[PDB]
Design a binder for this molecule. Structure first.
Ligand SMILES: CCCCCCCCCCCCCCCCCC(=O)OC[C@H](COP(=O)([O-])OC[C@H](O)COP(=O)([O-])OC[C@H](COC(=O)CCCCCCCCCCCCCCCCC)OC(=O)CCCCCCCCCCCCCCCCC)OC(=O)CCCCCCCCCCCCCCCCC
Ligand SMILES: CCCCCCCCCCCCCCCCCC(=O)OC[C@H](COP(=O)([O-])OCC[N+](C)(C)C)OC(=O)CCCCCCCCCCCCCCCCC
Ligand SMILES: CCCCCCCCCCCCCCCCCC(=O)OC[C@H](COP(=O)(O)OCCN)OC(=O)CCCCCCCCCCCCCCCCC
Ligand SMILES: CCCCCCCCCCCCCCCCCC(=O)OC[C@H](COP(=O)(O)OCCN)OC(=O)CCCCCCCCCCCCCCCCC
Ligand SMILES: CCCCCCCCCCCCCCCCCC(=O)OC[C@H](COP(=O)(O)OCCN)OC(=O)CCCCCCCCCCCCCCCCC
Ligand SMILES: *C(=O)CCCCCCCCCCCCC
Lengths: 62, 165, 128, 177, 65, 79, 459, 55, 87, 171, 155, 122
């Protein structure tokens, strides 16, 4: 009982709100809709392994 | 939006030049900066306007807190004609008030430089209502005028508050 | 030399600038002493009840009761229908009714005529 | 104009009130203390120049154009003391000025938290309710016929008696409760 | 001990408020000089604004006629 | 409990702008009675207050010193 | 509905056979049990109404009105037992019997399947209300006010009797369930013009319509507290309920007959709200605010869109709770200062802080603060009248300024400023009074969590 | 703006007394806007709220 | 903050302001030193003394109360009454 | 969960984390701390409750209304058949309302998920939304607060007469 | 309170005017009723139509926030001249001069915004040039159609 | 801002109006002027989700800069060179816009001289 504020006001609300979001909100469609991640040339998709091909070689300016 | 923001930032900064209640001066300051925010919305720069919100929050809350430190130290005195000599008697309040005024006017590379100066760099270089631009620049000069009015009548000079310090 | 102050309805003349303040006559001293006497009698009659330890409640002011009875109950028994009251009661009574009737009827006739011709963009309008 | 005991303002009172208002509005105009002190001596010299005017019509006229001078040369936002009317702290603490009779409405379990205070209060209440009929019969034996001319109240003309109508002047709340 | 009030004279000052005020004033001027030393173009200008009159007519495609 | 007020005789207006005020009032035949009351605002620790450009340049000295120290540190650190 | 009619009737032997110290507590207890049972009306369906019998039915319009009606009786008993404490015992029982009889008329007013039984109960609600105002009102003007309340209603409603019997002869029935399916279009004529007026003017008086509202700042002012609660919380809503039942039969003529009345309401809610800026009588200020709020329900019924009916029933339930709480607050001052003058007792937050919090919450729900159901009804009527005509938002929005301005001025005059010095009988708030405020306000704020039960037949 | 207001600030230490102009009274009385509009627009409402609508 | 005022402190401050006033010698001055009858001061001087009291203690005395303060003890007692000292 | 074809989602393509800097991001540390301190105890409590659910499993059903004859083949003023037709029509009206709600949810989810290129990448959802709103507006707009199957049939007949007259006058 | 201390009809005979002045606790020389045009005032006094802020703020008032004594006849619009509301106090600048200055300033500023909208400022540049047919597909243009080619060249 | 005076206070027919310009063909004075070449693929700046003002002829430097800025978190000062490359190529684009304005100014002066030579001749 020295960090009881970090337990009662933080950690138990993180428990409750993560339970509510994980098993009652995301179980329903379109309740949490995230923007799809920004894809760059040279990236590797974690789900597939498809390498994004790089850009054209630059007409170098300086 | 451009015309209304330029009208507001001219009028409130002009009214700020002759006020003597310090909270009224800082209120006309923040309404002038809100008019500048409406200006930089009106030139199709909404993210610079939001950057100026996030910038303006820090130093304008700090200017009100320094003025409240002066008000509480002078026994609920809010008029700047009963101030003076507070450069050395209140050193931390003086330091933070001068830093807040320099951030408000746009001293280079303080926080108010990183939005407001860029706002002017987009207010000039755009297809703009030119009277709105010229009144925005007149308001920009008026900001420096009321900032050094605060610093002059509050921190500089000799005291005007009563005798039981 | 100096601009004379012009009193208006929402900005009266100051006491320091009024000429009738500077009357040094006897009858103004009569009127002011009589107003002081009436006000002192009212003040005494108030605070003989206000400072009373036995009184516990509301010192009823006949001025306040009289004010509310004038503002509410004495209005119709002292009404006389005449030229001014008829013109003001028909000007502020049915004038705005006629005005908003013709404005809203004109707007809705214009809107219905646009809608039944297929002109008004009512594309995503399915809440009404 | 409007005074509790006086029925009017004398010429001397009008001159002194104009002199104080002129110095206050001048100090609003002349912010710095040496500079106001200089112009305050100059304005005192202007008031001293017509001090020995035995002609009352000439003096009343000079008062009138001096009021015109003042109404021209006043500051638009003059300085007001904070607890003075128009000030920034005026009537601020009136929400904290709970009247004393509300202490009669307390529960006994919160009157028993301060036993000395309410035991000391009941003798004030007893003192007031014995003083009341004496000060009523003092007021009715001293007020002239036709009622009181002025709002001036008398003191206690005996020893042991309290002044008439004293309770709400003495038991008024503090300025900083 | 806290600060005792004085009459008609300059009040008692803590050392801590003096060193904090001087430290943040020095920090302001350090940061201003540092960012003016390293950036130097947010104030004075980033890229050279060219003179359009100095441009030749051949690169602008103007047949002399 | 008791607060001790200082000696009233020390607030003489010599060395203050109240002295210049009394000079200009004696130049036309007047005299200022409230100068010694105003004398404490211009004397003591409130004497010699800074200008506005001196108020802006608070901390410029130590700040510029630490700036030169850091510029020398980063110039020696890259080599 | 006979499971609600018979307990309301059994409140009569419950109040006439109780011991003399027990006649408030027993009636309060069992009226709260009836109000607890009133939630079984919430068996409402998306397609069909809850049709109990040949005589009684309940859709989602009548159900919130029935729950509010059965909830208002315990609150009226709590409000009216202090100022009738010195009353004779038999007259006290007659008062409670008039409130029970009024509730008994109201619950089969709202559930009448047939429209002439609706008319008979709708006009049976006059007699207990008239007796309560003219017998237990405080001032002299209660007799005149009872006359105005009686003879505006009957002058509006005796044409409605002839109109309903005419529909009875023409269509063969006044069953609302039959007339849902046998309704004929009402063509443009003068016969159908005065048909429309005879169907609508009784409910225009009951709402009240602006111009016909003159009975209300007498009858809601010259009444005791239970009378003001039942008048402003339920009896103004008989007009809106009757219009929402009767405009089924009045199409398509309503689509141009509504145009004057809409003006009378759209300008009326500007005027009466403005009247609340300059009222000295606090109870009259709440009365003219009631006229101002019910003008929106008149407009929403007369534009007859779905969003308008949803907002109108939400605004009726919300205004019932809010205006009943405001009258109870005005009575909580009037039991202490014995005057309804608003400028008399000022600065009452210095003396009654929790009661000033109740004043604050009632005034915030009065000014339609989101997400209260006050704002839900206000906002939906604004949406539907914007779809009606895009200009009306001006008359809406200006109203939504003035609705703020009297709601806070009432808060500033009564609760703020320096208190009146000569008034020293300001007792602390009794537990009964704060109980009454909480039983007004806590249902009103809990309905913001689930507003779909107070949104009516076409949610 | 800083330099012009330094001139403004240093002209306050001078031993001269000036009468207020109309630019100064226009700025000091809040562009005259809370003086006019907070006296006029309540007036034309509240008389109309009592004399026309109420009475 | 806000140190309390005492009658000794208010007396010392009022006489301290009057000793800084060139039309009053500090050895003749006492708390009963009447301004017109003993010190021989003008009514304008009395108005300036009450204004110095206002600038000293930081509050405004109204003129109907200012024109009756004709000795230092009445000024000290008025400041005692308006600041509620010796609680 | 739900049905992934009535609420469709495109395949998530997240990039592999390719850190170029040498400083550690705090987000991986906070992700591991959230996995340990939060995600595992919430998972254990949910598995406990789900075991308690599986100890007694019982079922609820979607109510199936068979179709009754609609308002067209009901006789005039025949309340027993046109009542059933009206209840059928009101259930269909509430269901069509929720179909519009489904398509609005699709459009809003597409706009947020596509982010900045939402105007190009959500053309099919915009097109389905425009079609379903045109259908709902032709079917149910302007009926009024006293809507019925008769009102909707009269609106449909007026629309069909307008379409027939516009077709016939163009030939 | 009784009937002959309540407000009554408009006084015409001078004894009725003096009885009204005695009823409202004011002098007969100062009692002036509202003029009988039939607006429903009766014998109610036309008090001089000044605000309550104008009163002496240092006077010992019975009601301090109202600045109003006991038994003093209230103004007809006393709820309007409370200090929360309409103030008729004298202003340093004249009312007409204030209205002229505010109207002229607002009209001049709106005039000059219209002037600057007629004559805008800009930079000496060409239009911003975007690839892919002025971004045809990115602005929601349909791919089943084909736009005109927008071609940009080097300079 | 002297061009504001040359269009407003001077004569306006010889200054190019920025709303509708170029008024001349792009080959008028140019034997085989070559096109501006887009480096970043439309699908690449679609998957980079760039703002529709940022999808100009130099968006590829911005794509490299944003990939740097993501790949170097939390070090938010470690992509100054990519930011300078993007700012310099935006500067080159602004210079090209200035060149278009100057080309239109000199062509309107050419049309003024052409019509004056015509009116002097015939
Ligand atoms: C289904 C279960 C639901 C459970 C959750 C409950 C849901 C809400 C229910 C009601 C909650 C408020 C009740 C208390 C207020 C009334 C009494 C009061 O003033 O007490 C002060 C007192 C503390 O003060 P004090 O110092 O002791 O003395 C008072 C002072 O003298 C002087 O007091 P003061 O002036 O200093 O303080 C008053 C202050 C004054 O502050 C204000 O007036 C400001 C409020 C407005 C601005 C801020 C809110 C704006 C709206 C946003 C919030 C809602 C949406 C949020 C979601 C995200 C966005 C959508 O107000 C508050 O502190 C209350 C905060 C909450 C206000 C709610 C909004 C009211 C405004 C008007 C309506 C607007 C729409 C309402 C929508 C409600 C939705 C549920 O509180 C109590 O003693 C609390 C008593 C117990 C309350 C029980 C509440 C539930 C009752 C329901 C029973 C049956 C269901 C079972 C559930 C039980 C749960 C426990
Ligand atoms: C609040 C106070 C005012 C209340 C106003 C109430 C409504 C205003 C109009 C009321 C008119 C009377 C009732 C109409 C009933 C209509 C029923 C019907 O079948 O109509 C069609 C019938 C038509 O006849 P029919 O239907 O038998 O004919 C067969 C059909 N055709 C027409 C095709 C041949 O209308 C009438 O017969 C007459 C209707 C008008 C009656 C006018 C007389 C009353 C005068 C006004 C009284 C106003 C209120 C009085 C109180 C005022 C205050 C004290
Ligand atoms: C017209 C006219 O002059 O009416 C005055 C008349 C009384 O005549 P008088 O002026 O006294 O001679 O007064 C009358 O004839 C009585 C009033 C005439 C009708 C007034 C109609 C409108 C009244 C307000 C309605 C608001 C709804
Ligand atoms: C006073 C207190 C506040 C108000 C409370 C409510 C009181 C009023 C209630 C009734 C309001 C008036 C009646 C309803 C108006 C409906 C629209 C209307 O009548 O428009 C005017 C009409 C236009 O002609 P039109 O409607 O086509 O008439 C042919 C009908 N087949 O014009 C005409 O036909 C010419 C005029 C004909 C006379 C009509 C008389 C009967 C109606 C008024 C009674
Ligand atoms: C992009 C477009 C931009 C357009 C911008 C301009 C639009 C609005 C135009 C002007 C309207 C608003 C201003 C006028 C009303 C201001 C009222 C007010 O705030 O009064 C304040 C006044 C007290 O003020 P003050 O004397 O300063 O107090 C300190 C010392 N007592 O307090 C009082 O006197 C109390 C008053 C209480 C009763 C109020 C009565 C007036 C109500 C006015 C309603 C206006 C409705 C406008 C609707 C607009 C719809 C579009
Ligand atoms: C021509 O001058 C083009 C520049 C934009 C219009 C003029 C802007 C003038 C104000 C900005 C510069 C101020 C320098 C003190």
């Amino acid at each position: 009982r020295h960090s009881i504020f970090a337990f009662t006001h933080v950690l138990i609300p993180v428990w409750i709100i993560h339970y509510y979001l994980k098993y009652h909100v995301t179980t329903k469609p379109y309740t949490i809709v995230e923007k799809k991640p920004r894809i760059f040339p040279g990236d590797t998709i974690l789900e597939t392994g498809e390498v994004i091909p790089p850009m054209k070689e630059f007409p170098d300016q300086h | 939006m451009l015309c209304l923001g330029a009208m507001t930032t001219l009028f409130t900064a002009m009214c700020a030049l002759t006020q003597n209640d310090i909270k009224k001066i800082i209120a006309f300051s923040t309404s002038s900066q809100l008019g500048l925010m409406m200006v930089t919305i009106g030139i199709n720069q909404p993210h610079l306007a939001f950057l100026h919100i996030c910038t303006h929050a820090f130093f304008k809350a700090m200017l009100f807190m320094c003025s409240g430190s002066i008000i509480h130290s002078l026994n609920d005195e809010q008029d700047i004609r009963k101030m003076g000599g507070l450069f050395k008697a209140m050193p931390f309040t003086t330091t933070a008030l001068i830093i807040g005024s320099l951030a408000l006017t746009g001293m280079p590379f303080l926080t108010g430089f990183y939005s407001k100066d860029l706002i002017i760099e987009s207010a000039n270089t755009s297809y703009t209502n030119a009277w709105a631009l010229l009144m925005t620049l007149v308001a920009t000069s008026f900001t420096a005028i009321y900032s050094t009015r605060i610093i002059f009548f509050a921190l500089l000079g000799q005291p005007r508050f009563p005798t039981l310090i | 030399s100096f601009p004379k102050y012009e009193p208006s309805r929402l900005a009266s003349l100051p006491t320091t600038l009024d000429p009738a303040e500077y009357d040094i006559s006897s009858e103004t001293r009569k009127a002011q002493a009589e107003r002081l006497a009436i006000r002192s009698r009212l003040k005494r009659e108030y605070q003989l009840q206000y400072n009373d330890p036995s009184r516990r409640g509301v010192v009823e002011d006949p001025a306040l009761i009289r004010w509310t009875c004038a503002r509410s109950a004495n209005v119709y028994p002292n009404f006389r229908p005449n030229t001014k009251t008829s013109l003001l009661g028909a000007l502020f009574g049915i004038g705005p009714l006629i005005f908003w009737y013709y404005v809203f009827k004109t707007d809705r006739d214009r809107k219905e005529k646009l809608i039944q011709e297929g002109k008004l963009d009512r594309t995503f309008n399915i809440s009404y | 104009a409007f005074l509790p005991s006086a029925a009017y303002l004398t010429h001397q009172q009008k001159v002194l009130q104009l002199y104080k208002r002129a110095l206050r509005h001048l100090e609003s105009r002349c912010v710095h203390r040496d500079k106001y002190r200089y112009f305050a001596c100059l304005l005192r010299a202007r008031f001293d120049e017509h001090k020995n005017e035995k002609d009352m019509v000439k003096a009343t006229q000079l008062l009138r154009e001096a009021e015109k001078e003042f109404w021209h040369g006043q500051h638009p936002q003059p300085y007001i003391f904070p607890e003075s009317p128009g000030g920034t702290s005026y009537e601020r603490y009136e929400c904290y000025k709970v009247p004393e009779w509300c202490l009669d409405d307390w529960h006994p379990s919160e009157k028993a938290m301060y036993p000395d205070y309410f035991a000391k209060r009941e003798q004030w209440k007893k003192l007031r309710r014995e003083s009341w009929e004496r000060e009523v019969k003092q007021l009715q034996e001293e007020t002239p016929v036709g009622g009181p001319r002025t709002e001036a109240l008398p003191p206690a003309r005996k020893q042991g008696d309290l002044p008439p109508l004293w309770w709400h002047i003495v038991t008024r709340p503090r300025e900083r409760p | 001990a806290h600060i005792e009030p004085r009459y008609r004279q300059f009040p008692q000052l803590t050392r801590s408020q003096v060193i904090q005020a001087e430290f943040f004033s020095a920090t302001m001027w350090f940061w201003i000089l540092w960012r003016f030393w390293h950036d130097s173009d947010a104030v004075l200008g980033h890229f050279p604004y060219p003179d359009p009159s100095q441009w030749t007519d051949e690169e602008l495609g103007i047949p002399p006629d | 409990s008791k607060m001790e007020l200082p000696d009233y005789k020390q607030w003489k207006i010599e060395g203050t702008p109240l002295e210049t005020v009394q000079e200009k009032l004696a130049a036309r035949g007047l005299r200022d009675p409230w100068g010694r009351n105003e004398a404490w605002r211009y004397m003591g620790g409130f004497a010699n207050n800074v200008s506005f450009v001196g108020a802006l340049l608070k901390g410029f000295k130590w700040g510029f010193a630490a700036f030169v120290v850091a510029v020398g540190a980063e110039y020696y650190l890259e080599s | 509905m006979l499971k609600y009619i018979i307990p309301t009737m059994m409140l009569m032997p419950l109040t006439w056979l109780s011991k003399n110290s027990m006649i408030w507590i027993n009636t309060t207890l069992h009226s709260l049990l009836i109000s607890l049972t009133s939630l079984l009306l919430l068996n409402q369906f998306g397609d069909n109404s809850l049709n109990f019998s040949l005589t009684f039915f309940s859709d989602s319009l009548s159900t919130p009105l029935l729950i509010l009606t059965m909830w208002l009786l315990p609150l009226m008993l709590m409000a009216s037992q202090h100022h009738l404490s010195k009353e004779n015992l038999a007259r006290k029982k007659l008062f409670i019997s008039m409130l029970i009889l009024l509730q008994l008329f109201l619950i089969m007013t709202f559930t009448a399947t047939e429209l002439i039984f609706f008319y008979i109960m709708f006009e049976a609600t006059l007699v207990p209300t008239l007796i309560i105002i003219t017998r237990w009102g405080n001032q002299t003007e209660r007799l005149n006010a009872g006359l105005y309340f009686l003879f505006y209603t009957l002058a509006g409603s005796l044409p409605l009797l002839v109109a309903l019997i005419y529909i009875q002869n023409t269509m063969g029935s006044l069953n609302f369930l039959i007339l849902q399916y046998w309704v004929q279009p009402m063509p443009n004529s003068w016969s159908n013009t005065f048909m429309w007026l005879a169907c609508m003017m009784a409910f225009m008086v009951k709402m009240p319509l602006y111009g016909l509202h003159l009975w209300l700042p007498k009858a809601h002012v010259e009444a005791p507290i239970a009378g003001s609660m039942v008048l402003a919380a339920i009896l103004l809503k008989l007009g809106g309920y009757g219009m929402m039942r009767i405009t089924l039969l009045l199409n398509p003529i309503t689509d141009f007959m509504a145009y004057p009345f809409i003006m009378l309401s759209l300008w009326g809610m500007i005027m009466t709200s403005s009247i609340c800026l300059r009222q000295t009588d606090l109870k009259s200020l709440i009365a003219y605010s009631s006229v101002s709020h019910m003008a929106l329900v008149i407009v929403a019924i007369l534009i007859q869109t779905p969003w308008s009916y949803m907002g109108a029933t939400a605004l009726m339930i919300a205004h019932g709770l809010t205006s009943s709480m405001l009258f109870c607050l005005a009575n909580s001052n009037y039991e202490r200062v014995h005057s309804r003058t608003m400028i008399l007792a000022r600065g009452l937050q210095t003396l009654l802080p929790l009661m000033a919090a109740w004043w604050l919450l009632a005034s915030l729900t009065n000014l339609a603060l989101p997400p209260s159901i006050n704002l839900i009804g206000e906002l939906f009527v604004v949406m539907s009248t914007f779809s009606w005509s895009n200009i009306t938002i001006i008359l809406m929005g200006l109203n939504m300024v003035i609705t703020a301005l009297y709601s806070l001025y009432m808060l500033i005059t009564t609760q703020r400023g320096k208190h009146t010095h000569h008034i020293n009988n300001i007792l602390p708030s009794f537990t009964r009074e704060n109980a009454l405020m909480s039983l007004h306000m806590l249902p009103l704020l809990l309905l913001s969590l689930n507003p779909k039960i107070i949104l009516g037949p076409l949610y | 703006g800083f330099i012009l207001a330094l001139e403004i600030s240093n002209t306050t230490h001078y031993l001269k007394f000036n009468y207020p102009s109309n630019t100064f009274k226009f700025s000091n009385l809040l562009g005259y806007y809370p003086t006019i509009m907070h006296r006029l627009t309540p007036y034309m409402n509240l008389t109309m709220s009592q004399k026309s609508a109420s009475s | 903050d806000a140190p309390p005022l005492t009658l000794e402190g208010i007396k010392d401050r009022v006489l301290y302001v009057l000793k800084l006033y060139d039309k009053i010698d500090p050895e003749k001055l006492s708390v009963n030193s009447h301004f017109m009858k003993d010190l021989g001061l003008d009514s304008l001087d009395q108005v300036e003394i009450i204004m110095a009291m206002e600038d000293e203690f930081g509050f405004e005395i109204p003129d109907i109360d200012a024109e009756k303060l004709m000795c230092p003890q009445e000024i000290v007692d008025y400041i005692a009454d308006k600041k509620d000292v010796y609680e | 969960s739900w049905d992934k074809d009535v609420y469709p989602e495109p395949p998530r393509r997240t990039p592999a984390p390719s850190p170029q800097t040498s400083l550690p991001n705090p987000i991986t540390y906070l992700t591991k701390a959230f996995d340990l301190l939060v995600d595992r105890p919430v998972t254990l409590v949910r598995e406990f409750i789900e075991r308690q659910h599986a100890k007694n499993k019982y079922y609820y059903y979607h109510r199936e209304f068979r179709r009754v004859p609609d308002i067209t083949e009901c006789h005039e003023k025949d309340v027993l058949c046109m009542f059933e037709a009206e209840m059928q029509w009101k259930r269909d009206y509430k269901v069509d309302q929720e179909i519009v709600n489904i398509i609005q949810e699709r459009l809003k989810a597409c706009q947020q998920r596509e982010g900045e290129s939402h105007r190009q990448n959500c053309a099919k959802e915009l097109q389905q939304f425009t079609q379903v709103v045109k259908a709902y507006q032709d079917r149910y707009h302007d009926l009024g607060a006293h809507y019925s199957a008769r009102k909707c049939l009269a609106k449909q007949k007026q629309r069909m007469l307008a379409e027939r007259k516009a077709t016939k006058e163009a030939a | 309170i009784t009937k002959d201390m309540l407000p009554g009809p408009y006084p015409k005979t001078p004894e009725e005017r003096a009885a009204a002045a005695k009823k409202y606790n004011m002098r007969v020389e100062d009692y002036e009723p509202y003029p009988d045009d039939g607006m429903g005032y009766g014998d109610y006094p036309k008090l001089p139509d000044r605000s309550q802020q104008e009163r002496d703020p240092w006077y010992d008032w019975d009601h301090p926030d109202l600045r109003l004594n006991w038994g003093e006849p209230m103004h007809w619009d006393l709820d309007m001249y409370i200090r929360n509301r309409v103030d008729t106090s004298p202003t340093p600048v004249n009312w007409n001069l204030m209205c002229k200055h505010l109207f002229g300033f607002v009209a001049f500023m709106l005039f000059m915004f219209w002037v600057g909208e007629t004559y805008p400022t800009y930079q000496p540049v060409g239009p911003k040039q975007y690839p892919y047919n002025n971004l045809y597909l990115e602005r929601g243009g349909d791919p089943n159609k084909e736009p005109e080619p927008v071609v940009h060249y080097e300079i | 801002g002297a061009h504001l005076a040359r269009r407003y206070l001077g004569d306006a027919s010889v200054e190019p109006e920025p709303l509708r310009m170029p008024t001349f063909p792009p080959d008028y004075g140019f034997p085989e002027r070559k096109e501006r070449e887009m480096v970043a693929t439309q699908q690449e700046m679609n998957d980079a989700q760039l703002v529709l003002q940022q999808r100009d002829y130099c968006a590829h430097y911005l794509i490299r800069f944003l990939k740097c800025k993501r790949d170097s978190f939390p070090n938010f000062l470690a992509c100054k060179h990519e930011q300078h490359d993007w700012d310099y190529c935006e500067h080159l684009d602004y210079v090209k816009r200035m060149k278009e304005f100057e080309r239109e100014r000199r062509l309107l002066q050419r049309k003024k001289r052409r019509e004056q030579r015509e009116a002097d001749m015939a």
